[PDB]
């Protein structure tokens, strides 16, 4: 199997998580952010992630990829219950986290931005949809306060460091990518159960945190 991604893309992280949790090899390939030709040839639209199955078929959609991979060996791991409280929290934080993440992604040394044109493509598309990056960065301290406050609420919902609801579930798939990407945001106050879950799930999934790149 092969997986076509951007390193910053949370949907790509979801797909990467199931390969890491099950110790399944996969050939990761980062596409440039301005590359429409490759994904459109594969799945008829420009988006990532894209899985190539062993028989050469290409398949988009992070949660279809997660479901497919988790069933291959007949022993799915994502058997635990989801939590309405976690869904509510993610609904709230996914409503604004991009205001912190997008301007920081755009400055950072991710492979999908390795040409000037690919980085500029991201900046121009995302300033159009999310707003002027200088203005988003001007509001960093208020947005960091908001994240830190919301992380204190999440802290009470982290049942175990290895699984947000106590048994591995799709809520780990939905939550970890956001926490991983938030480690790029210098200044966040991380509560202890959230921090332990972040670190434990990074190890289980073999996905790097971005703490060393934080800005």
131 versus 191: smaller Cβ distance to ligand GSH? 131
Q: How far is CA 111 from CA 5, 77, 80, 151, 174, in A?
A: 10, 30, 34, 29, 23
65 versus 86: smaller Cβ distance to ligand GSH? 65
Q: Give the shortest CB-170-to-ligand GSH separation in angstroms.
A: 12
Q: Residues with Cβ < 8 Å from 138, sequence gap 6 or more?
A: none
Residue 4 pairs in a beta bridge with: 29, 50
Contact 185, 97 (CB under 8 A): no
Binding mask 54-83 for ligand GSH (x = CB under 6 A): ------xxxx--------------------
Out of 30, 32, 43, 48, name the contact with ligand GSH by CB under 6 A: 48
Q: Give the shortest CB-213-to-ligand GSH separation in angstroms.
A: 18
Q: Which residue has the CB atom at the shortest distance from ligand GSH?
A: 9
For the purposes of burial, counting CB atoms within 10 Å of the CB of 182, is it exposed (0-12), middle (13-18) or buried (19 or more)?
A: buried
Instruction: Assess 47 for contact with ligand GSH (CB under 6 A).
Output: yes
Contact 12, 5 (CB under 8 A): yes
188, two tokens: 């966040």
Q: Which stretch binds ligand GSH (CB under 6 A): 41-49, 51-59, 157-165, 205-213?
A: 41-49
Instruction: Assess 11 for contact with ligand GSH (CB under 6 A).
Output: yes
Radius of gyration over every alpha carbon of the chain, rounded to an integer in angstroms: 17
Instruction: Assess 6 for contact with ligand GSH (CB under 6 A).
Output: yes
* Residues at the interface with ligand GSH (CB under 6 A): 6, 9, 11, 33, 46-49, 60-63
């Amino acid at each position: 199997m092969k997986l076509y991604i951007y390193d910053h893309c949370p949907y790509c992280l979801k797909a990467r998580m199931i390969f890491g949790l099950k110790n399944i090899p996969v050939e990761l390939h980062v596409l440039l952010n301005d590359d429409a030709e490759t994904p459109t040839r594969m799945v008829g639209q420009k988006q990532v992630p894209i899985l190539q199955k062993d028989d050469s078929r290409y398949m988009p959609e992070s949660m279809d990829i997660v479901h497919y991979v988790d069933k291959l060996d007949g022993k799915p791991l994502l058997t635990g219950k989801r939590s309405p409280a976690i869904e509510e929290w993610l609904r709230k934080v996914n409503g604004y986290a991009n205001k912190l993440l997008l301007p920081r992604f755009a400055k950072s040394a991710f492979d999908e931005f390795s040409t000037p044109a690919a980085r500029k493509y991201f900046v121009d598309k995302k300033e159009a949809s999310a707003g002027n990056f200088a203005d988003l960065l001007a509001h960093s301290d208020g947005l960091i306060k908001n994240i830190s406050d919301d992380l204190r609420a999440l802290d009470k919902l982290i049942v175990k460091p290895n699984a947000v609801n106590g048994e591995l579930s799709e809520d780990d798939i939905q939550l970890f990518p956001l926490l991983r990407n938030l480690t790029l945001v210098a200044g966040i106050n991380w509560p202890s159960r959230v921090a332990d879950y972040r670190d434990n799930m990074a190890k289980q999934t073999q996905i790097n945190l971005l703490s060393s790149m934080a800005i």
